[PDB]
Write a protein that binds this ligand. Structure first.
Ligand SMILES: Cc1cc2nc3c(=O)[nH]c(=O)nc-3n(C[C@H](O)[C@H](O)[C@H](O)COP(=O)(O)OP(=O)(O)OC[C@H]3O[C@@H](n4cnc5c(N)ncnc54)[C@H](O)[C@@H]3O)c2cc1C
Ligand SMILES: Cc1cc2nc3c(=O)[nH]c(=O)nc-3n(C[C@H](O)[C@H](O)[C@H](O)COP(=O)(O)OP(=O)(O)OC[C@H]3O[C@@H](n4cnc5c(N)ncnc54)[C@H](O)[C@@H]3O)c2cc1C
Ligand code: SF4
Ligand code: SF4
Ligand code: FES
Ligand SMILES: [Mg+2]
Lengths: 279, 463
């Protein structure tokens, strides 16, 4: 009928973890895959990554950052509330082989998204360096969790309030300039961050994979809402990805397409806030 | 015989009213009008009536019409007997009477259409089903069927909840099977729910079929993408047979330069946002949709007409840009006329060369190639036409992602599942039908395939 919320955890301001009862998805989910959710009958469908699974509990875990109407409304949900629709696991699993040294880069909520991939890379015998990017100290989360599946962790804050000062890319550029051996870079975060990572590694010829985050509706290949240009060819991220070779992605097109509904997104958020002012 | 050559018209809402909403345009017959139209039928013998041969499932059209005429003074009995006859061959008459391209089927074959207007068979079938639904007469006939069910203890899985899968499931349930339908989207109905808009197929008609399936004891599991959520091998282990009704739900997108500019939608995305997500009610509903002042719809089938008329209801000036001639359009003639009435503009013998953007990556114009007539070929002449939005509606095809994951399943080069004379696939015990075996086709063919596959499954499991 619907999907029970087993547990909710506030990981940082605006970053909410939900453990959801879904034995089918837990049984089949692999690192890198995602779900579409819809909260209620008037809601929209949105994609969220499967950040963890617990087969013994028949559960999956998603971590949703509050960025607009649907994720703000989701952030109010409690354990024992229900998510009306959860479709998964979607997308192609991350490709896990022995590469050598893998640098996993998570920006913001991308830190939750990279955890299952980092864990799978480590289990395959890779040397794993995880770069975690946050805006400021109070947004830092899952440092210990990522350390548990990494050989090295580098935490960055834009303002230097915790860890290394600067962007994810500053930490990565430091590793490159030190001459560290790097066989693969995986980036998950805001499109602006993934573009910046791709542009930094391209001159060095370092293989770089990004998990793309375009607009999605059905998430099953029916519509092309999620389309991207990769190596000059149109691909649908929900079925052909969402991971692609970052050096072949048209980043400016992806960012253009992600901005298209900005005015309507604002109208919807403003309506929700306006209608809950009285108390 | 003497022929009454003019059809009894069905009332329709005014253009000015109906372009302000997504409500049904054609209001259908009343009892008095339906009986008058039925009286025009010449009652050709069933063994040769050309309308019957033109109906893809060969409904006894003169028979159900006669049931109306013989009960002029008892509309409830008339409709009950007519619907009983129709249901011998068709599970979905409220839908097919609305959406069949009858001019290519029953009505195009009707004798009266050679000298005048053919019998309005679709609207009579629709009337029978609608009147029955409004008065509980269909429920009476369904309960009569349910009384006759003898459970047989065997389980069948249906993949996909479009007309093929819904129809197969109902027939299998009537035969005593325990049926589960698995559906990837959050609501069943397939194209009936996300593709065809409410202004010609009201959602209550589809919801009625889901209520019937509930009463028949069919289980429906939404949010199950077979191949991902549950594997095909897991279904084969759990079920005695499987029917694949997964449709042709991938958009055909030609590699035009600029096709990823903002404001360009596939028809599937545009229509799913409108119909399934109710984006025309934004922000009451949360899914947005954006149309500019001028919309181009590329194509000439029902999908194109539905996208164009939806965009017009969102306030745009709308153009159909079609690569062939008017006579070659494949949309239902009735809906092409409705689109003309509602103000859709039409341009023929044109096809896009490229889409042109502005600095922000938004669509600004389309460079069009002129065509001449046998396939159309470009004349070499091109011109640029300004547009804010474009909707691509040049056809759909099956999802090869799903199909390649099904172990042992033979599929042709167009993505159609290969089946034998019993609709059985290359995997024994796995059957398929509808758009999954035909490519894009019709609702009535998907319904017919679901019934044929249910009979084949019964034969296979009974032997
Ligand atoms: C494959 C995939 C996996 C994702 N995983 C996660 C995750 O694990 N955690 C997380 O916090 N976020 C994730 N996202 C992003 C998430 O989908 C969006 O942040 C969310 O849809 C925002 O919706 P909203 O209504 O809260 O805000 P809105 O105002 O609707 O949107 C705000 C921003 O989100 C983007 N967005 C809007 N609508 C959509 C849509 N339908 N699909 C995708 N992006 C959209 C826009 O670019 C916009 O800048 C993922 C996106 C994709 C494509
Ligand atoms: C816009 C549009 C307008 C149309 N108008 C008309 C008309 O006026 N008249 C007419 O006769 N025909 C029309 N058609 C064609 C008609 O709708 C189809 O021929 C008919 O719907 C086919 O039904 P089906 O069940 O075989 O396929 P579908 O209805 O596509 O059934 C597939 C369904 O199963 C589900 N599914 C698919 N794959 C999977 C999977 N791997 N796992 C789980 N679930 C899955 C999907 O949710 C989908 O809804 C139209 C089609 C379109 C797109
Ligand atoms: S089903 Fe389609 S074709 Fe057969 S009768 Fe009803 S309308 Fe005419
Ligand atoms: S053909 Fe036209 S007239 Fe002859 S039976 Fe069928 S409908 Fe009635
Ligand atoms: S979102 Fe519909 S195709 Fe990927
Ligand atoms: Mg939103």
């Amino acid at each position: 009928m619907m999907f029970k919320i087993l547990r909710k955890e506030r990981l940082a301001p605006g970053i909410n973890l939900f453990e959801i009862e879904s034995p089918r998805i837990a049984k089949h989910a692999k690192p890198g895959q995602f779900v579409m959710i819809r909260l209620h009958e008037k809601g929209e469908r949105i994609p969220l990554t499967i950040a963890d699974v617990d087969i013994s509990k028949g559960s999956i875990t998603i971590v949703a950052q509050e960025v607009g109407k649907t994720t703000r409304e989701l952030g109010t949900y409690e354990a024992g509330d229900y998510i009306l629709d959860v479709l998964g696991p979607l997308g192609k699993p991350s490709h896990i082989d022995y590469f050598g040294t893998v640098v996993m880069i998570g920006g913001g909520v991308g830190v939750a998204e990279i955890y299952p991939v980092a864990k799978a890379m480590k289990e395959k015998g890779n040397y794993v360096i995880s770069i975690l990017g946050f805006r400021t100290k109070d947004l830092v989360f899952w440092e210990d969790k990522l350390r548990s599946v990494s050989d090295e962790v580098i935490v960055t804050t834009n303002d230097g309030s915790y860890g290394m000062k600067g962007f994810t890319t500053h930490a990565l550029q430091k590793l490159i300039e030190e001459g560290r051996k790097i066989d693969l870079v995986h980036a998950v975060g805001p499109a602006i961050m993934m573009k910046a990572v791709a542009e930094l590694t391209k001159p060095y010829g370092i293989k770089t994979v990004a998990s793309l985050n375009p607009i999605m509706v059905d998430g099953t290949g029916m519509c092309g809402a999620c389309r991207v240009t990769v190596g000059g060819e149109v691909k649908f991220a929900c079925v052909d990805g969402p991971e692609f070779d970052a050096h072949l992605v048209d980043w400016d097109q992806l960012m253009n397409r992600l901005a298209y509904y900005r005015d309507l997104e604002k109208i919807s958020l403003e309506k929700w806030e306006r209608e809950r002012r009285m108390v | 015989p003497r022929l009454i050559k003019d059809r009894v018209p069905t009332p329709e809402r005014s253009v000015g009213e109906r372009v302000r909403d997504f409500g049904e345009v054609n209001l259908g017959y009343s009892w008095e009008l339906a009986l008058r139209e039925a009286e025009r039928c010449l009652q050709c013998p069933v063994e040769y009536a050309p309308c019957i041969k033109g109906c893809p499932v060969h409904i006894n059209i003169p028979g159900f019409i006669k049931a109306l005429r013989e009960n002029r003074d008892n509309p409830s009995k008339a409709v009950r007997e007519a619907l009983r006859i129709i249901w011998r061959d068709n599970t979905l008459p409220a839908i097919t009477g609305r959406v069949c391209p009858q001019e290519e089927q029953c009505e195009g074959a009707c004798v009266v259409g050679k000298v005048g207007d053919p019998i309005n068979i679709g609207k009579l079938e629709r009337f029978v089903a609608d009147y029955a639904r409004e008065h509980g007469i269909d429920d009476e006939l369904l309960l009569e069927e349910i009384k006759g069910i003898k459970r047989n203890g065997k389980k069948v899985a249906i993949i996909g909840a479009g007309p093929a899968g819904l129809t197969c499931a109902a027939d299998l349930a009537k035969m005593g099977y325990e049926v589960t339908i698995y559906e990837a989207l959050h609501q069943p109905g397939g194209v009936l729910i996300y593709g065809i808009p409410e202004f010609r197929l009201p959602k209550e008609i589809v919801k009625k079929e889901l209520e019937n399936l509930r009463r028949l004891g069919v289980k429906i599991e939404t949010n199950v993408l077979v191949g991902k959520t549950i594997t095909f091998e897991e279904l084969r282990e759990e079920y005695d047979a499987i029917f694949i009704g997964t449709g042709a739900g991938t958009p055909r997108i030609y590699p035009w330069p600029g096709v990823n500019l903002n404001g360009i939608y596939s028809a599937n995305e545009f229509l799913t946002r409108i119909n399934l997500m109710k984006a025309y009610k934004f922000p009451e509903y949360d899914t947005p949709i954006k149309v500019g002042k001028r919309v181009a719809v590329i194509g000439g089938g029902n999908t194109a007409m539905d996208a164009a008329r939806s965009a017009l209801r969102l306030g745009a000036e709308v153009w159909i840009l079609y690569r062939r001639t008017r006579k070659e359009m494949t949309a239902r003639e009735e809906e092409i006329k409705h689109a003309e009435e509602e103000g859709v503009k039409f341009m023929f013998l044109v096809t896009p060369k490229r889409f042109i953007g502005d600095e922000n990556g938004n669509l600004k114009a389309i460079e069009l190639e002129k065509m001449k007539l046998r396939r159309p070929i470009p004349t070499g002449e091109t011109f640029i036409m300004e547009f804010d939005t474009a909707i691509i509606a040049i056809g759909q095809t099956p999802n090869k992602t799903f199909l390649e994951t099904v172990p042992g399943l033979k599929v042709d080069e167009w993505g159609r599942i290969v089946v034998d004379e019993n609709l059985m696939t290359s995997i024994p015990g796995v059957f398929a039908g509808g758009d999954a075996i035909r490519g894009e086709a019709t609702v009535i063919l998907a319904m017919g395939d679901g019934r044929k596959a249910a009979k084949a499954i019964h034969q296979y499991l009974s032997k």
